[PDB]
C-alpha cells in the first residue's frame, strides 16, 4: 500500500510518501457551500489529474490558497483540488480520500 489510484478507473494519482501534514495533520474534514462533507488528504504532489479552469479564492478551506478543481485525467472523476497562490508551500493537492484506492507500487 504505497500508491494511490483513482478508485473509479485505476489512473495513478499519488503516493503515501507524498502525504503532507498541513497545519499538523495530513487529514482535514471540510464542507462546501452545498453541505457536502469531504475527508481531504493533503499531498505535496500528484499526477494523472486534469486541473479545470483558473484558480478561485472563494470559500477556500486553506487560508491564503486559491483552488482549482482536480479531475481524474483519465475518467473525469472529481478527485479533489489543486491549491496555489499561498506560502510554504506555494502549492499542494487536497484529495478526497474515499475517491482513491491504495495499493502496491508499480
Ligand atoms: Zn479515474
Amino acid at each position: 500500500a504505497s500508491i494511490f489510484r483513482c478508485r473509479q478507473c485505476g489512473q495513478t494519482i499519488s503516493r503515501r510518501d507524498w502525504l503532507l501534514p498541513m497545519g499538523g495533520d495530513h487529514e482535514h474534514v471540510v464542507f462546501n457551500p452545498a453541505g457536502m462533507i469531504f475527508r481531504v488528504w493533503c499531498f505535496s504532489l500528484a499526477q494523472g489529474l486534469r486541473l479545470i479552469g483558473a484558480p478561485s479564492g472563494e470559500f477556500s478551506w486553506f487560508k491564503g490558497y486559491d483552488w482549482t478543481i482536480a479531475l481524474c485525467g483519465q475518467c473525469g472523476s472529481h478527485l479533489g483540488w489543486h491549491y496555489e497562490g499561498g506560502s510554504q508551500p506555494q502549492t499542494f493537492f487536497g484529495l478526497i480520500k474515499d475517491r482513491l484506492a491504495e495499493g502496491p507500487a508499480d
Side-chain angles (χ1 to χ4, degrees):
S2 95
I3 74 128
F4 292 103
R5 288 180 181 288
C6 176
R7 178 180 174 179
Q8 295 307 126
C9 74
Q11 177 76 321
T12 311
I13 301 299
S14 193
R15 301 190 68 100
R16 172 161 292 274
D17 284 344
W18 298 341
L19 286 165
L20 168 65
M22 288 287 300
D25 203 336
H26 66 262
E27 183 172 274
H28 293 256
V29 187
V30 293
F31 311 79
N32 76 5
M36 302 177 62
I37 190 175
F38 297 98
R39 181 200 292 285
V40 174
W41 277 20
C42 297
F43 291 90
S44 289
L45 187 54
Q47 63 185 108
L49 299 158
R50 188 157 57 86
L51 307 181
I52 306 306
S56 178
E58 291 184 1
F59 301 116
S60 182
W61 294 313
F62 299 96
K63 179 160 180 48
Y65 301 89
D66 312 305
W67 56 264
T68 53
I69 290 169
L71 303 181
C72 178
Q74 184 160 261
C75 79
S77 178
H78 180 206
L79 300 184
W81 304 269
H82 188 240
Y83 288 92
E84 69 194 272
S87 300
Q88 198 165 345
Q90 293 176 309
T91 69
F92 68 97
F93 297 81
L95 302 181
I96 301 156
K97 189 253 203 198
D98 45 299
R99 300 202 186 167
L100 302 169
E102 185 169 9
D106 57 357

